[PDB]
Design a protein around this ligand. Structure first.
Ligand SMILES: Nc1ncnc2c1ncn2[C@@H]1O[C@H](CSCC[C@H](N)C(=O)O)[C@@H](O)[C@H]1O
Ligand SMILES: Nc1ncnc2c1ncn2[C@@H]1O[C@H](CSCC[C@H](N)C(=O)O)[C@@H](O)[C@H]1O
Ligand SMILES: [Cl-]
Ligand code: NA
Lengths: 318, 318
């Protein structure tokens, strides 16, 4: 039945996770056809068990078959590229911490104690958990950087970054937004604020180890908040925006790069439940963003679509 | 996108898990509409968080909406019934033991050291884990009992159980197959063999605490193996059938009630990966069953369809 299919859908996700995690995926570049017997021998996997996994991946349209040889389907070819968005999701999404968070979604709803399903499952908030696991953080950080890679060209078209001299990426992680930005937009003071166990290095980017709940570095004319605000409950989001307001000058800009609840967005509902489970975060409409801005002592000056899901919100001091 | 959607489709599974586990589903009997605010108040869930879950359940076709009011979709009305197949799956499938088994699927393939993904994840094999968790075992056993409820009518008019005097259900669990069988096939000697922390009690049914790897009781003219063989690798399946051979008389019958890889067996690959991860089990075609029987000194006398996925295989002594 349709309902039976929905309940067992998670097995499709796990089949893809397994294909990548085993190291098999990177042998299927450019829709090339592989002998399963050969792969099984190389990796010391039982042929029959590997063939049964491939049969399932054929059934769900990830693999195609021809003369006892298997290739990635046209739509799933990106899975052979380890730097593809889909590969980076497959290498992050199924980490034991986030996987177990989902089981505590019901408990997190019934308790209503300000603890996310993730914190109930793992005994630590999401970003504390990442702070304690270097390899898992690099997998998350890599996925976030790929999001900046996919958006930078769309971003240039909707906002003139060249009008700014000093730019701070607030919660910028690896700082890939500014790395990509620095390729077209030259002779700027580029800086990134995040939580770092070790400060990263890249060109003349000023990486600052800090905490946007405590303070925001002053003296920047542009403050960028990309995929930050949706992580946080209202009060936490207001504190970040308020710390930004107190740090910034009267002629300075805050630019939110954010998913926004718009009429057509299936994808925002998937992010909404992920944000809830991960950190009691949420996706917001323009009215909810207006509320955050007003509470923080800011005003929205401009709103523009980056694409169907993503938008820029330009704020100044009220 | 189609690949991205397959990777995140587990969230659909968790959404239904959550809807049942919170106890929300039983509130929606007879396709009646509910106010989401009243629902939230009844269960002490934050209204906004419950609304966001409901928006996801509408998107995936579990709920239908009329403004602030939601009802179960025609296809998902069974979630209101706590005794439905889909409800019993939702209450079993997402136990932390089996959920975490899926993460160890890649390691189980690469290790190839006779240990299931379940045993790697949980530190003990599937049926040992159920031995030590009574509440979880009752949820597993209930789901198995429902499978018997579903096929007993089709099973009656495919095999004449009335021709036998003494019947043993080997790995029969709660013994629901014989319970339901006894309703229309009366004045028989019914017996169930399984591993029990406490003996079930029903009518004249002889519940026997045993281990089908060690011995099968003698003196029954019918031995039923329903949904047992597919749990086991070839060597364990042969041993079970060997123990049935050594127990049974020359005039006695073994009846395998089993999922079979046959033409128009739609959902066999889903069960196949489940059996692999759970206990290094597998689904088999008639040839593979032929091999198991021959190795255990048995002969396939008859094969018949129960439905599109389930078959009966009639065995006698070679
Ligand atoms: N207290 C805090 N102070 C600063 N940065 C924080 C923080 N808590 C979380 N973050 C950072 O907020 C980021 C959210 S993910 C978004 C990353 C990046 N802006 C991008 O769009 O690709 C992470 O890099 C995380 O480390
Ligand atoms: N060593 C063993 N000896 C006896 N029964 C065993 C066993 N290992 C597993 N089982 C039982 O095998 C069954 C597999 S599930 C199938 C149950 C039932 N025949 C039905 O079709 O609904 C479980 O009840 C489990 O407890
Ligand atoms: Cl939330
Ligand atoms: Na960045």
């Amino acid at each position: 039945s349709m309902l039976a299919e929905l309940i067992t859908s998670y097995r499709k996700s796990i089949a893809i996770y397994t294909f990548v995690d085993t190291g098999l995926s990177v042998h299927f570049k450019n829709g090339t056809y592989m002998d399963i017997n050969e792969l099984a021998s190389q990796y010391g996997i039982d042929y029959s068990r590997l063939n049964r996994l491939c049969d399932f991946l054929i059934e769900i349209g990830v693999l195609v078959s021809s003369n006892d040889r298997v290739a990635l389907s046209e739509e799933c070819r990106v899975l052979a590229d380890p730097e593809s968005m889909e590969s980076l999701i497959a290498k992050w999404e199924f980490n034991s911490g986030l996987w177990n968070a989902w089981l505590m979604y019901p408990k997190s709803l019934l308790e209503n104690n300000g603890k996310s399903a993730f914190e109930i499952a793992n005994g630590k908030p999401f970003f504390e958990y990442l702070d304690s696991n270097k390899l898992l953080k690099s997998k998350f950080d890599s996925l976030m950087s790929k999001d900046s890679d996919k958006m930078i060209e769309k971003l240039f078209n909707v906002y003139d970054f060249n009008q700014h001299d000093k730019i701070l990426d607030v919660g910028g992680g690896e700082g890939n937004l500014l790395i990509r930005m620095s390729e077209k937009v030259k002779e700027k003071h580029y800086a990134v604020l995040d939580r770092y166990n070790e400060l990263p290095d890249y060109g003349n980017i000023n990486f600052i180890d800090g905490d946007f709940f405590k303070s925001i570095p002053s003296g920047y004319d542009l403050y960028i908040l990309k995929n930050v605000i949706h992580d946080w409950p209202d009060n936490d989001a207001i504190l970040i925006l308020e710390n930004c307001r107190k740090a910034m000058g009267n002629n300075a800009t805050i630019l939110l790069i954010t998913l926004m609840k718009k009429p057509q967005s299936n994808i925002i509902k998937y992010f909404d439940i992920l944000m809830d489970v991960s950190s009691l975060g949420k996706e917001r409409d323009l009215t909810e963003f207006e509320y955050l801005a007003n509470q923080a002592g800011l005003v929205i000056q401009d709103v523009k679509d980056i694409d169907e899901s993503y938008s820029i919100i330009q704020l100044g001091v009220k």
